[PDB]
Structures are given as structure tokens and as C-alpha cells.
Design an enzyme around this catalytic site. Structure first.
Site, PDB file in Angstrom:
ATOM      1  N   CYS A 104       0.825  -1.214   0.000  1.00  0.00           N
ATOM      2  CA  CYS A 104       0.000   0.000   0.000  1.00  0.00           C
ATOM      3  C   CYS A 104       0.853   1.255   0.000  1.00  0.00           C
ATOM      4  CB  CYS A 104      -0.961   0.037   1.226  1.00  0.00           C
ATOM      5  SG  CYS A 104      -1.856   1.615   1.416  1.00  0.00           S
ATOM      6  N   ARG A 162       0.148   4.695   2.887  1.00  0.00           N
ATOM      7  CA  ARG A 162       0.228   4.463   4.308  1.00  0.00           C
ATOM      8  C   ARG A 162       0.680   5.659   5.158  1.00  0.00           C
ATOM      9  NH1 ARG A 162       3.899  -0.715   4.728  1.00  0.00           N
ATOM     10  NH2 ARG A 162       4.364  -0.229   2.506  1.00  0.00           N
ATOM     11  N   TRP A 174      -9.191   6.492  -0.462  1.00  0.00           N
ATOM     12  CA  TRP A 174      -9.518   7.180  -1.720  1.00  0.00           C
ATOM     13  C   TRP A 174      -8.597   6.701  -2.817  1.00  0.00           C
ATOM     14  CZ3 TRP A 174      -8.074  10.042   2.719  1.00  0.00           C
ATOM     15  CH2 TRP A 174      -6.727  10.456   2.769  1.00  0.00           C
ATOM     16  N   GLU A 180      -5.037   4.004 -10.697  1.00  0.00           N
ATOM     17  CA  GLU A 180      -5.877   2.833 -10.504  1.00  0.00           C
ATOM     18  C   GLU A 180      -7.022   2.801 -11.511  1.00  0.00           C
ATOM     19  OE1 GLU A 180      -6.659   1.471  -6.373  1.00  0.00           O
ATOM     20  OE2 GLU A 180      -6.016   3.551  -5.900  1.00  0.00           O
TER      21      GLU A 180
HETATM   22  C1  HEM Z   1      -6.007   6.865   2.065  1.00  0.00           C
HETATM   23  C2  HEM Z   1      -5.950   6.598   0.777  1.00  0.00           C
HETATM   24  C3  HEM Z   1      -5.272   5.393   0.222  1.00  0.00           C
HETATM   25  C4  HEM Z   1      -4.598   5.354  -1.057  1.00  0.00           C
HETATM   26  C5  HEM Z   1      -4.436   6.478  -2.058  1.00  0.00           C
HETATM   27  C6  HEM Z   1      -4.180   3.938  -1.087  1.00  0.00           C
HETATM   28  C7  HEM Z   1      -3.480   3.429  -2.225  1.00  0.00           C
HETATM   29  C8  HEM Z   1      -3.364   2.006  -2.536  1.00  0.00           C
HETATM   30  C9  HEM Z   1      -3.051   1.516  -3.903  1.00  0.00           C
HETATM   31  C10 HEM Z   1      -2.887   2.315  -5.177  1.00  0.00           C
HETATM   32  C11 HEM Z   1      -2.936   0.061  -3.759  1.00  0.00           C
HETATM   33  C12 HEM Z   1      -2.665  -0.894  -4.887  1.00  0.00           C
HETATM   34  C13 HEM Z   1      -4.086  -1.350  -5.269  1.00  0.00           C
HETATM   35  C14 HEM Z   1      -4.038  -2.282  -6.440  1.00  0.00           C
HETATM   36  O1  HEM Z   1      -3.236  -1.992  -7.369  1.00  0.00           O
HETATM   37  O2  HEM Z   1      -4.805  -3.289  -6.423  1.00  0.00           O
HETATM   38  C15 HEM Z   1      -3.176  -0.236  -2.329  1.00  0.00           C
HETATM   39  C16 HEM Z   1      -3.065  -1.557  -1.759  1.00  0.00           C
HETATM   40  C17 HEM Z   1      -3.496  -1.889  -0.413  1.00  0.00           C
HETATM   41  N1  HEM Z   1      -3.977  -0.972   0.433  1.00  0.00           N
HETATM   42 FE1  HEM Z   1      -3.980   1.126   0.393  1.00  0.00          FE
HETATM   43  N2  HEM Z   1      -4.499   3.127  -0.046  1.00  0.00           N
HETATM   44  C18 HEM Z   1      -5.127   4.033   0.764  1.00  0.00           C
HETATM   45  C19 HEM Z   1      -5.785   3.682   2.018  1.00  0.00           C
HETATM   46  C20 HEM Z   1      -5.866   2.343   2.570  1.00  0.00           C
HETATM   47  C21 HEM Z   1      -6.603   2.022   3.828  1.00  0.00           C
HETATM   48  C22 HEM Z   1      -7.456   2.947   4.661  1.00  0.00           C
HETATM   49  C23 HEM Z   1      -6.308   0.590   4.024  1.00  0.00           C
HETATM   50  C24 HEM Z   1      -6.792  -0.279   5.138  1.00  0.00           C
HETATM   51  C25 HEM Z   1      -7.291   0.299   6.221  1.00  0.00           C
HETATM   52  C26 HEM Z   1      -5.440   0.147   2.903  1.00  0.00           C
HETATM   53  C27 HEM Z   1      -4.885  -1.196   2.733  1.00  0.00           C
HETATM   54  C28 HEM Z   1      -4.280  -1.726   1.509  1.00  0.00           C
HETATM   55  C29 HEM Z   1      -4.091  -3.175   1.377  1.00  0.00           C
HETATM   56  C30 HEM Z   1      -4.378  -4.241   2.402  1.00  0.00           C
HETATM   57  C31 HEM Z   1      -3.534  -3.283   0.026  1.00  0.00           C
HETATM   58  C32 HEM Z   1      -3.105  -4.498  -0.747  1.00  0.00           C
HETATM   59  C33 HEM Z   1      -4.298  -5.274  -1.248  1.00  0.00           C
HETATM   60  C34 HEM Z   1      -3.731  -6.491  -1.931  1.00  0.00           C
HETATM   61  O3  HEM Z   1      -2.747  -7.054  -1.427  1.00  0.00           O
HETATM   62  O4  HEM Z   1      -4.274  -6.881  -2.984  1.00  0.00           O
HETATM   63  N3  HEM Z   1      -5.241   1.199   1.942  1.00  0.00           N
HETATM   64  N4  HEM Z   1      -3.500   0.944  -1.555  1.00  0.00           N
HETATM   65  N1  PQW Z   2      -8.554 -12.864  -9.546  1.00  0.00           N
HETATM   66  C1  PQW Z   2      -8.053 -12.082 -10.506  1.00  0.00           C
HETATM   67  N2  PQW Z   2      -6.783 -11.653 -10.413  1.00  0.00           N
HETATM   68  C2  PQW Z   2      -6.262 -11.229  -9.228  1.00  0.00           C
HETATM   69  C3  PQW Z   2      -5.279 -11.958  -8.547  1.00  0.00           C
HETATM   70  C4  PQW Z   2      -4.762 -11.503  -7.329  1.00  0.00           C
HETATM   71  C5  PQW Z   2      -5.235 -10.306  -6.787  1.00  0.00           C
HETATM   72  C6  PQW Z   2      -6.224  -9.577  -7.469  1.00  0.00           C
HETATM   73  O1  PQW Z   2      -6.746  -8.391  -7.015  1.00  0.00           O
HETATM   74  C7  PQW Z   2      -6.611  -7.924  -5.681  1.00  0.00           C
HETATM   75  C8  PQW Z   2      -5.432  -6.958  -5.675  1.00  0.00           C
HETATM   76  N3  PQW Z   2      -5.918  -5.765  -5.018  1.00  0.00           N
HETATM   77  C9  PQW Z   2      -7.362  -5.694  -5.017  1.00  0.00           C
HETATM   78  C10 PQW Z   2      -7.876  -5.252  -3.666  1.00  0.00           C
HETATM   79  O2  PQW Z   2      -6.993  -4.312  -3.059  1.00  0.00           O
HETATM   80  C11 PQW Z   2      -7.110  -2.972  -3.255  1.00  0.00           C
HETATM   81  C12 PQW Z   2      -7.869  -2.518  -4.335  1.00  0.00           C
HETATM   82  C13 PQW Z   2      -7.975  -1.161  -4.553  1.00  0.00           C
HETATM   83  C14 PQW Z   2      -7.338  -0.270  -3.702  1.00  0.00           C
HETATM   84  N4  PQW Z   2      -7.470   1.048  -4.015  1.00  0.00           N
HETATM   85  C15 PQW Z   2      -7.636   2.007  -3.107  1.00  0.00           C
HETATM   86  N5  PQW Z   2      -7.272   3.199  -3.359  1.00  0.00           N
HETATM   87  C16 PQW Z   2      -8.280   1.604  -1.825  1.00  0.00           C
HETATM   88  C17 PQW Z   2      -9.197   0.633  -1.487  1.00  0.00           C
HETATM   89  C18 PQW Z   2      -9.451   0.661  -0.126  1.00  0.00           C
HETATM   90  C19 PQW Z   2      -8.763   1.603   0.642  1.00  0.00           C
HETATM   91  S1  PQW Z   2      -7.741   2.491  -0.460  1.00  0.00           S
HETATM   92  C20 PQW Z   2      -6.572  -0.725  -2.607  1.00  0.00           C
HETATM   93  C21 PQW Z   2      -6.463  -2.090  -2.386  1.00  0.00           C
HETATM   94  C22 PQW Z   2      -7.850  -7.103  -5.331  1.00  0.00           C
HETATM   95  C23 PQW Z   2      -6.724 -10.040  -8.682  1.00  0.00           C
HETATM   96  C24 PQW Z   2      -8.936 -11.707 -11.664  1.00  0.00           C
HETATM   97  C25 PQW Z   2      -9.910 -10.720 -11.869  1.00  0.00           C
HETATM   98  C26 PQW Z   2     -10.492 -10.775 -13.148  1.00  0.00           C
HETATM   99  C27 PQW Z   2     -10.020 -11.788 -13.989  1.00  0.00           C
HETATM  100  S2  PQW Z   2      -8.808 -12.673 -13.104  1.00  0.00           S
END
Ligand code: HEM
Ligand code: PQW
Ligand code: HEM
Ligand code: PQW
Ligand code: H4B
Ligand code: H4B
Ligand code: ZN
Lengths: 407, 411
Positions: free
Chosen positions: A106, A109, A278, A283
């Protein structure tokens, strides 16, 4: 054992000791790096509880006090008796903030300590879950001035009584396979969209249909609910230079809210823990809009720009990509909906890493995820070495509920 | 043990068994990943197994494993090690070795080309003047008036660690950098320290923004000597833009031939500390990194000014816009002058096909994602979406410390 990370642009060297705390495994070995792979009982529980309470009491400068030693005994008695235990409110809040603090993937953070925690451990039904979720959505949205929040449902017990939100995010757009072989709307959501339809949801069958919530309380069959439209803030996408951009009919939602992850605190497992912050602009503009397997709009956009699409070397994809991302940011900003650009976010993350190194002795960071999906090397994170390792409390993946659920 | 990698755009899953042949260590453990860390005298003792392992791989490649010729060569190498403490590679083994070091280079996106490599054997070289001669010939062969051909020149291997051949230059062709008294830099900031060494050694610096550096060459452990590459052998491309007529007036150019001169080539336990190799550029190397890194020429601001973009907020993406324009210019300039170059779309698509081919015929392809993904537009290239497994195979190219840090000066 003490490890150094270097920023190759600024020559700043940081020393990592925090990794020595790490307990869980990475997937890597001395012989193979798995850095780019996407997914690499009573007796188990007390160590996990102890380790957590130890860092909690240390965080409030009360390590080795009677309050510490008392709480350790109390939880130990509770585990011995009930085979589980309950977190105090203070511990729950600390745990959730730290799970975010520890999320190595993330970039957002720097914000970790400003998280509103909604304790929904008293919830018992899917209607109650729906209520908590609407309250979270309204609170987090704050009319466009977004605020980070998490809602925490009851913890896993025997594992046959799981609370789950079946949706991958609280707000997402529907995906439909068509007679053409083509896909209308978001292809990422086709299977979940099918589950909803086959569950009873009558689908508008459009490009941007807000999905219904499928909520599972206490291991029961999940139930459908429409989020009130007035609670879903959406942004029409237009360009500050190109008039025709609005003609594409693009929009996105303001509130990103992950709902399919598992929060682990002190060995306890919270399988329904929707959290939101947000967006970073990439993204939506890069991944959601331009992935070949997503809305995949690059072709249509380049056409409207009248670019030479004959040769890859004209960089027509790259030109269109930039414009799309200018439009996403311009739109959210124009409508006063919080968004961060990748330059600002990555700059903030470097500053956060520095804070964490001096304050905590390190910061687990997954470079593959932290570096934005466009313009990598013109952001500072590209030039920053990062050490990736797993600390608890944590957010973890868990399998999609439909594969598991016993109807 | 079989390991799977998935492409998330195509769902294509691949199975790796080649990682089983890896011996060397990655830097990672089960508790820490060091995937983004830039840098994570052998006795007879360690040498024979390294030789045996290599020769087994070589004789296997030529379908002669366990043959009389295979066994005799093992015997011959063994006797040579025990009596001389080292051994000499046959010409064929050297060629096979150099090609495989490239095939095994996990950070190289250009490996679809690995088997087309012109190997120049410079192991009879004895002096710095001899090295200059060899390098000139390599540059002229590789350049081929713009139709670039991949090549490697291989100087004598390490013996006692006191007689090393080394090219002090990090690349055969590279621009000087000069730190000014006011703290600004003229030319390429990456090459300031090396430029300073050249001057102290006696180079007369023109003190411009694109001065081709002299070669600083060390033969046989002796003090290095300076040589100027004949300008007629140094192909350069003035950079202009297909639509922006003011772009030429930025005064930019780059050289056509990228040629790494500071790595070490390991083959069968032997160490070749001077092994300059060349290929051709992927456009982003110049347009993104050499031009736009804050630590390099850093032209983003000046480009964006001339495009009259809104520079008052990062969220206008002025940097991203200017970046794409510069990279179009780089590709346009090279193509118009008929100097080989590859764009990052084409190069990454080719790598994916190479990688799939390698999994099918070889059982794997070690790849370092951090390095393979281009430094712009990452997720619109297929490699971003490709899972990769990184492990170390030999023969290999390895880093070695800069020679001024280790050299014993004779005077
Ligand atoms: C405040 C604004 C925030 C921004 C701009 C932000 C940004 C991001 C971005 C760009 C990713 C990559 C997402 C992706 O490519 O799938 C990410 C991953 C992550 N974020 Fe943050 N985030 C924010 C807040 C938070 C909050 C509030 C939490 C939990 C309380 C959080 C927990 C995570 C987790 C657990 C992942 C990884 C998910 C995974 O492993 O697939 N984020 N965040
Ligand atoms: N299963 C698939 N691939 C795949 C494999 C591993 C991970 C994955 O997605 C996770 C990665 N990451 C996603 C959730 O984590 C997120 C997502 C968005 C995100 N963006 C933000 N700004 C925030 C969300 C919440 C607080 S900030 C922050 C964290 C959900 C998709 C397929 C989909 C369709 C065909 S195959
Ligand atoms: C044929 C055209 C080629 C192209 C377009 C190509 C492309 C690249 C690029 C873009 C990098 C990353 C460079 C950086 O960011 O510093 C690289 C790394 C590398 N390449 Fe290739 N390459 C090609 C040929 C070769 C040849 C002929 C060899 C050796 C025989 C080679 C061996 C390597 C090695 C050893 C690295 C890693 C350098 C390091 O670890 O610092 N390449 N190549
Ligand atoms: N010393 C620094 N950091 C640092 C640390 C480790 C490695 C490094 O650069 C190596 C990596 N990489 C470079 C050599 O490898 C290359 C270079 C270019 C290249 N490009 C091509 N297309 C080809 C060249 C030859 C055949 S293809 C292919 C491989 C040289 C720089 C700094 C420099 C400036 C400020 S701090
Ligand atoms: C295979 C590779 O690990 C995969 O495509 C990753 C790369 N980096 C990423 N980075 C972020 N932030 N989000 C992602 O979904 C991915 N996908
Ligand atoms: C810290 C980080 O590993 C470093 O900046 C790397 C990232 N990826 C790279 N990739 C390539 N091809 N070349 C590089 O110089 C780098 N730099
Ligand atoms: Zn690793």
C-alpha cells in the site's frame, strides 16, 4: 541481520531492523525470488495473542506493568476456557491501524493513523450488515471529502459461521458476457455479476451498473441489497482540453472500498472487514480503463485523438494513456472528490518510509506493487530500494466465498 | 518440484523445472524478499566441479553427453587444473559459454536474440594497445553503419587476481560529466567520477555536454592507459521530434551503440573480468532514464516549458506528457537515421514469446520483473502482467567492483 536500503537518486541509506520481528513466510528462498508472484487451535492462539498484546502495551509505554501482566493472564484464562478471546476496543482500533501500517503493498500508508474504526462486532444478520455498510459508505464519502474507514464484523469462531461480504469492493460495476463474444461493462466482475443475477438481481445490463451487495451473516446464505444511489458518489469523466472526451460516456465511483480481505489481529480472524480510503488516479485511468482485460479503452481513445496507430513505435498507446489519466484527475478534482495523482502519492510514501525507518526501524514495502503502473522511473519510488516482509496485525487474501460456501 | 507462473492478462500458466539447476543464492529468504535491492582467486578445490558442471551442460547441448569426446575433455580439464591450477576453454566452449551467460541474464529483456551473438576471442591479448585494437574492431563490427549486430569481446581470464584485464569505462561509448564550482553539472552526471579519473590520467577534456570519453584500459594487472576511439567509428544520432520543430534546438543527441564494459563473465568457474558486450538500445533507456532521471540529463522541465504545459501542479501530468514526447523523439530520430532501436512495446512482446519458448524447450526462463518492466507505461506492456521467477544460472554476467577502488598502482 541489520539490512540497508538505498535510494539511488538521493543516496539516502536507511537501516532496517524491523524485519527481524517478522514471523510469516514470503514465498522466496535462497534459491528463488517470487517477488512478482501475485499470491506466493488453543495452542496456536496464545502465542499469537501474547505477541500482539506485547506490542500493544509497548506502544502505550506500559510494557511490563501490572496492567500488561493482568491482561495477558485474562486473555490466557479466556482462551483456556472459551478457546478464543475478545479484543478490548482500544486493542481492536490499534490492531486495525497496524494492519494498514503493515500492508507492504500500500502506497497510501502515510495516512495510517487516521483511520475511523467502526466496531460492528455486535452484528447478527445480513440486514444489519447492510445497515453498517451504508453507514460506512456515507461516513467515508463525506460528500466527496473522503475519509478512511474500516467496519469490523464478528470474528471467525468454528469457521462454519463466517461473516463475509461476497463483493470484491463495496462499490463496483457489473460485467456481462454477450452474444458477440464481447463483454459489456467490467470483465473483472462477470462471475460475481452472474451470481447476483442468478440470485435474483435484475440487471440494467449496461456499461456502468453499480452492483448490489451480497452479504453473508453467520455462515448463512448471502442476501442481495441495493446501496441507495444517493450514497454512491460517481464522477463523469471529461477532459480539460478535449471536448469529445465526454462523448465516450465514461464514469467512475469516488469511493474505493475493499471488502474481500481477512483482518488478522492477535490470532483472531475477521473475515468481513470492509475498508476504504480514496483513489490514486492511475488505478482508474491506467488499470481500470486500459488493462486489456478491463474496460480496455485505449483503442477507442487513440482513434478520437487521430493518432497514427499503424506502428507501436509512434507511442500512440502511451500518448492516449497520459490523456486518459489527465481526464480522471481533472474530473475528480473538478467535482471535489478526493483523489491523489501518482507523483503526489509516491512522494508521500518516500516521506512515510523515512518516518517509519527512524520511528519504527523499518517499513515493509513491495516494490512491484508500490511503483505506479505508468511513468515508473519519473516517480521517486522507482529509485528506492524496499525490503518486503510480513508483519502482523495484517490484511490477508482469502478465497472467494462461493467456492467455499455450503448452501 | 514444479513451480507455476501465470500471466494475468491471458491466463497462460507456465511450469518451471529449470530453477532446480540453480546453485547460486538470490539474496532472499523465507522471511525477507530482496527483489528490489540493486546489488543483493579460486583454488583447484572449488574449480573442478565448476568445470565438470559446465562441460556436462556443454556436451548435453551438442547431443554428445557421456561420449568418448565428453569423457576425454573432462579428463583433460581435470589434469590441466591439477597441474596448472586453472584451464583454458576450447573456442567452441567459450562461444557456448558467452551465449549462455546472455541467455541466463535474468534482468535482460532482449534475450530472444541470445543465440545470435558474435564472439570475438581476445584471449591472446597482452597489452592495453592490444585491447584498444580489439575494442575498435568490435565497435566497427557491431555498429555496421547503423544495422547493429550483437557482439562480445573476451579478454584473458583472471589468473592470480593480480594480473586482471579490465576496461575501466562502464560502457565503451559514454559521455563525460563535469562537476562545476557552482555545484551544477555539465554533461552526464552518471560519469563524473570516471571523467575525473580520465582527466587525472591525462585526458584533455573538451568540457562540453556530449564529449565521448576516452577508453581507459588495463591489461595484465598493469596501470591503465588512455586511448581515444576514432570519431569516425562513433555513430551518433541528433534527436529531433516528428511534429515539434523546436525539439532539435534542445541540442540533444545520443550514441547508437550500447556496450557494457564493466561486468564479469563466469564460464565453468573461470572469470573473464574484461568482456565488453554490445547489442542495441530499447528507446526508454535513452528517453526515460538517460534523459529524464533527475540524476542524469534531467530534461523534463525544459521540455515541458517548450510544450507550454501547465507546470504548476503535478496532477496536470506535465511530466508524463513531456516524457512521452521525448520518447517519440528518440525512436523517430533513430529510425529516420536507420540506426537499430526497439520500442518497449515491441521489445516486451518479443520477450513474452521468448519466455514461453524457453519454458517449453528449456523448462524455464529466469527473469527479474523489477528490471524487465519498462520505466514508463509499465502496465500497458505485457510483461507487467506476467509472473516471473528469478534465480541464478551459470554461465553468468556478474557485477564487479569499480577498478579504481581495488587497483594496486604501480606508478
Ligand atoms: C487513504 C488513501 C489510500 C490510497 C491512495 C491507497 C493506495 C493504494 C493503492 C494504489 C494500492 C494498490 C491497489 C491495487 O493496485 O490493487 C493499495 C493496496 C493496499 N492498500 Fe492502500 N491506499 C489508501 C488507504 C488504505 C486504507 C485505509 C487501508 C486499510 C485500512 C489500505 C490497505 C491496503 C491493502 C491491504 C492493500 C493491498 C491489497 C492487496 O494485497 O491486494 N489502503 N492501496
Ligand atoms: N482474480 C483475478 N486476479 C487477481 C489476482 C490476485 C489479486 C487480485 O486483485 C486484488 C489486488 N488488489 C485488489 C484489492 O486491493 C485494493 C484494491 C484497490 C485499492 N485502491 C484504493 N485506493 C483503496 C481501497 C481501499 C482503501 S484504499 C486498494 C487495495 C484485489 C486479482 C482476476 C480478476 C479478473 C479476472 S482474473
Ligand atoms: C540485442 C539487443 C538488446 C536489447 C534491446 C537489450 C535490452 C536490455 C535492457 C533494456 C536492459 C536493462 C538495462 C538497464 O536498465 O541498465 C538489459 C540488461 C542486461 N542485458 Fe540485455 N539487451 C540486448 C542485448 C544484450 C547482449 C548482447 C548481452 C550480453 C551478451 C546482454 C546482457 C544483459 C545483462 C548482463 C544485463 C543486466 C545488466 C545489469 O544487471 O546491470 N544484453 N538489456
Ligand atoms: N552506481 C549507480 N548505481 C548502480 C548500481 C548497480 C548497477 C548500476 O548500473 C548497472 C546496471 N545496468 C548498467 C549495465 O547494464 C546494461 C546497461 C545498458 C544496457 N543496454 C543495452 N541495450 C545493451 C548494452 C549491451 C548489450 S544490450 C544493457 C545492460 C550498469 C548502477 C549509479 C549510477 C548513477 C547514479 S548512481
Ligand atoms: C505479475 C505481477 O506481479 C502483477 O501484474 C502485479 C504487478 N504489480 C501490481 N501493482 C499493483 N499496485 N497492482 C497490481 O494489481 C499489480 N499487478
Ligand atoms: C531500487 C530499484 O531496484 C532500482 O531503481 C531499479 C528498478 N528497476 C530497474 N530496471 C532497469 N531496467 N534498470 C534499472 O536501472 C532499474 N533500477
Ligand atoms: Zn524475493
Amino acid at each position: 541481520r541489520f539490512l540497508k536500503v538505498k535510494n539511488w537518486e538521493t543516496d539516502v541509506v536507511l537501516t532496517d531492523t524491523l524485519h527481524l520481528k517478522s514471523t510469516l513466510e514470503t514465498g522466496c528462498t535462497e534459491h528463488i525470488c517470487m517477488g512478482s508472484i501475485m499470491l506466493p487451535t488453543k495452542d496456536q492462539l496464545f502465542p499469537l495473542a501474547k505477541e500482539f498484546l506485547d506490542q500493544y502495551y509497548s506502544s502505550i509505554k506500559r510494557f511490563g506493568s501490572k496492567a500488561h501482566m493482568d491482561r495477558l493472564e485474562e486473555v490466557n484464562k479466556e482462551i483456556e476456557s472459551t478457546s478464543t478471546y475478545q479484543l478490548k476496543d482500544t486493542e481492536l482500533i490499534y490492531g486495525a491501524k497496524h494492519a494498514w501500517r503493515n500492508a507492504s503493498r500500500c502506497v497510501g500508508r502515510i495516512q495510517w493513523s487516521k483511520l475511523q474504526v467502526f466496531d460492528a462486532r455486535d452484528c447478527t444478520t445480513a440486514h444489519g450488515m447492510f445497515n453498517y455498510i451504508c453507514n460506512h459508505v456515507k461516513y467515508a464519502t463525506n460528500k466527496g471529502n473522503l475519509r478512511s474507514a474500516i467496519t469490523i464484523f464478528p470474528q471467525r469462531t468454528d469457521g462454519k459461521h463466517d461473516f463475509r461480504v461476497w463483493n470484491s469492493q463495496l462499490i463496483r460495476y457489473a460485467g456481462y458476457k454477450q452474444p458477440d463474444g464481447s463483454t459489456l461493462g467490467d470483465p473483472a466482475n462477470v462471475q460475481f455479476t452472474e451470481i447476483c443475477i442468478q440470485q435474483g438481481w435484475k440487471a440494467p445490463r449496461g456499461r456502468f451498473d453499480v452492483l448490489p451487495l451480497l452479504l453473508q451473516a453467520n455462515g448463512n446464505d448471502p442476501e442481495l441489497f441495493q446501496i441507495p444511489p444517493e450514497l454512491v458518489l460517481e464522477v463523469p469523466i471529461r477532459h480539460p482540453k478535449f471536448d469529445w472526451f465526454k462523448d465516450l460516456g465514461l464514469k467512475w465511483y469516488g469511493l474505493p472500498a475493499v471488502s474481500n480481505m481477512l483482518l488478522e489481529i492477535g490470532g483472531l480472524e475477521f473475515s468481513a472487514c470492509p475498508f476504504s480510503g480514496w483513489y490514486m488516479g492511475t488505478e482508474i485511468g491506467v488499470r481500470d480503463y486500459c488493462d486489456n482485460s478491463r474496460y480496455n479503452i485505449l483503442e477507442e481513445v487513440a482513434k478520437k485523438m487521430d493518432l497514427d496507430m499503424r506502428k507501436t513505435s509512434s507511442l500512440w498507446k502511451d500518448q492516449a494513456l497520459v490523456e486518459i489519466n489527465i481526464a480522471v484527475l481533472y474530473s475528480f478534482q473538478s467535482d471535489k472528490v478526493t483523489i491523489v495523482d501518482h507523483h503526489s502519492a509516491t512522494e508521500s510514501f518516500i516521506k512515510h518510509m523515512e518516518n517509519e525507518y527512524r520511528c519504527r526501524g523499518g517499513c515493509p514495502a513491495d516494490w512491484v506493487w508500490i511503483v505506479p503502473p505508468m511513468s515508473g522511473s519519473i516517480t521517486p519510488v522507482f529509485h528506492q530500494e524496499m525490503l518486503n516482509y510480513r508483519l502482523t496485525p495484517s490484511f490477508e487474501y482469502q478465497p472467494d466465498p462461493w467456492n467455499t460456501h455450503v448452501w
